[PDB]
């Protein structure tokens, strides 16, 4: 049938996972969306001429490591790894998310994009170069976004779909 892509948005609390997801799905900026709610949403889009379905898992809740969690995360075909440019701790957390993704996928090569969100803010602690260097070390794209203004949002998601397509051709 129509190609579906299962995308999972990961990262620390407060980085803008929900705001990014809601911009893609519902085309507006939502402030203070319940931080605890993990949910998924589908949207039909055309990317490079392909009509496809994006199923997006917007992660939330406590740090916990069950068999059920591992099984659910393994359903993801590609991962947005999100930090906020004003939050160094959120950047430092990326390594952990990448390692957990590789663990559950049982692969060194999982489609992923590094996303630096909140690029509309003046209060930046993570420079563009630090993030580009990390992404280069992982062999993945880096995209700066603002869920507030919608800068980079489509690019982030569509780049992840392109990473999935490249993986399928290997």
Ligand X SMILES: Nc1nc2c(ncn2[C@@H]2O[C@H](COP(=O)(O)OP(=O)(O)O)[C@@H](O)[C@H]2O)c(=O)[nH]1
Q: Which residues bind ligand X (CB under 6 A)?
A: 13-19, 31-33, 35, 117-118, 120-121, 146-148
Considering only residues 4 through 43, tell me which ones interact with ligand A1BEJ, judged by CB under 6 A: 10, 12-13
SS3 78: strand
Q: Tokens 């997801």 — which residue?
A: 21
Least separation, in Å, of the C-beta of 95 and ligand A1BEJ? 10
User: Are 156 and 113 in contact, with CB atoms under 8 Å apart?
Assistant: yes
Number of residues in contact with Mg ion, rule: CB under 5 A? 3
User: Are 26 and 68 in contact, with CB atoms under 8 Å apart?
Assistant: no
Spatial separation of the C-alpha atoms in residues 33 and 154, rounded to whole Å = 20
The secondary element (H helix, E strand) that includes residue 143 is strand 142-144
Q: Which is nearer to Mg ion, 14 or 165 (CB)?
A: 14
Binding Mg ion (rule: CB under 5 A), the pick from 18, 86, 90, 146 is 18
SS3 166: helix
Q: Which is nearer to ligand A1BEJ, 3 or 100 (CB)?
A: 100
Considering only residues 100 through 129, tell me which ones interact with ligand A1BEJ, judged by CB under 6 A: 100-101, 104
Q: Which is nearer to ligand X, 32 or 108 (CB)?
A: 32
- Among Mg ion, ligand A1BEJ, ligand X, none, residue 70 binds (CB under 5-8 Å by kind): ligand A1BEJ
User: Are 41 and 56 in contact, with CB atoms under 8 Å apart?
Assistant: yes
Least separation, in Å, of the C-beta of 49 and ligand A1BEJ? 31
Q: Identify which of 20, 16, 18 has the alpha carbon closest to the alpha carbon of residue 159.
A: 20
Residues in Cβ contact with 32 at an 8 Å cutoff, skipping those fewer than 6 apart: none
Residues near ligand A1BEJ (CB under 6 A) are 10, 12-13, 59-61, 63-65, 69-70, 73, 93, 96-97, 100-101, 104
């Amino acid at each position: 049938g129509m190609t579906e892509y299962k995308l999972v948005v990961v990262g620390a609390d407060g980085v803008g996972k929900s705001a990014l997801t809601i911009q893609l799905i519902q085309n507006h900026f939502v402030d203070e969306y319940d931080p605890t709610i993990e949910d998924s949403y589908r949207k039909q889009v055309v990317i490079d001429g392909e009509t496809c379905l994006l199923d997006i898992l917007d992660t939330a809740g406590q740090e916990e490591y069950s068999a059920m969690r591992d099984q659910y995360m393994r359903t993801g075909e590609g991962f947005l790894c999100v930090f906020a440019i004003n939050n160094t701790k959120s950047f430092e957390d990326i390594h952990h998310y990448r390692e957990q993704i590789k663990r559950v996928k049982d692969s060194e090569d999982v489609p992923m994009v590094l996303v630096g969100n909140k690029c509309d803010l003046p209060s930046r602690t993570v420079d563009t170069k630090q993030a580009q260097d990390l992404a280069r070390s992982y062999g993945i794209p880096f995209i700066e976004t603002s869920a507030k203004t919608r800068q980079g949002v489509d690019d982030a998601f569509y780049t992840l779909v392109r990473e999935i397509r490249k993986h399928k051709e290997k």
